[PDB]
From a paper:
Of particular clinical importance is the widely disseminated class A SBLs, including the mobile, plasmid-encoded extended-spectrum CTX-M and carbapenem-hydrolyzing KPC families (both produced in opportunistic Gram-negative bacteria, such as Klebsiella pneumoniae, Pseudomonas aeruginosa, and Escherichia coli), as well as chromosomally encoded L2 from Stenotrophomonas maltophilia (a lung colonist of cystic fibrosis patients). SBLs hydrolyze antibiotics via formation of a hydrolytically labile acyl enzyme intermediate, while MBL catalysis proceeds without a covalent intermediate. The diazabicyclooctanes (DBOs), including avibactam, relebactam, and others, are a new BLI class with improved activity against a wider range of SBL targets than classic BLI scaffolds. DBOs inhibit SBLs through covalent formation of a carbamyl ester to the active-site serine concomitant with DBO ring opening.
Residue numbers in the entry: 25 to 57, 59 to 252, 254 to 294
The structure:
Amino acid sequence: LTNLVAEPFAKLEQDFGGSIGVYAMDTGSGATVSYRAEERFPLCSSFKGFLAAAVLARSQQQAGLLDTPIRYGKNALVRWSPISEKYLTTGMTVAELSAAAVQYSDNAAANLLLKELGGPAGLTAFMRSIGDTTFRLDRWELELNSAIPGDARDTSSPRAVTESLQKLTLGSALAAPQRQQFVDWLKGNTTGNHRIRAAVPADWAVGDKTGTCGGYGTANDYAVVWPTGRAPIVLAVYTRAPNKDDKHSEAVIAAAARLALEGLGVNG
Ligand SMILES: *C(=O)N1C[C@H](NOS(=O)(=O)O)CC[C@H]1C(=O)NC1CCNCC1
């Protein structure tokens, strides 16, 4: 049921000047679209969705966790901390940091939550616990964005991203209340309007998390999409490119998402 219908991903990535990796799963039939799906690509900010899921998993055993107030200093506010910079003088709860990390890609929030989990290895351990043997987080914000060709640090594959996203949003890896909270955070993302969402009809529900490393044409998005009248679709689109100064493209990600939906025979 993989690649029943071929799609022109090679031409797409050639025009982009790099590599595109796609995995998309129709959760009704199990049909998939797959292109470079087992190659590694940098996560960039996209690890933050899985980070929030890991925090939610912890919260299943710690009923006070989400409402715990976290204080932080000015040193925590690295580049791109749009929410947490507004609450420097007050603190934020763990849930608020989680929402900020997911929905605004907030970097300080992500580092504070990583600390709660025992760092990159702690998040990696959570991913292992749900059966993801591919994912690895190695570094913190901002160092994890280096996106060096061939470097496996801070990478996963489109396939493992999709598989893990499915388990967490639709499967049983989270308890039901936490599952819905994760979905709701993804649905409220603000940074993805020009990526997978651009390929998804406005009358379908969709949650996503983006990433943009800032070098080597490296950027990404993953999403869970609920078309009306049929089962949900899970998909991941990752890019990279050979040269440090190669620029990412949001349009290329949207285009790849369109091809994936077309390959699944989902009318969009
Ligand atoms: C994540 O990859 N980020 C955080 C933020 N938005 O995330 S995104 O997925 O919407 O792109 C901005 C870019 C990126 C990030 O952390 N970039 C670093 C800081 C800015 N200098 C380049 C590396």
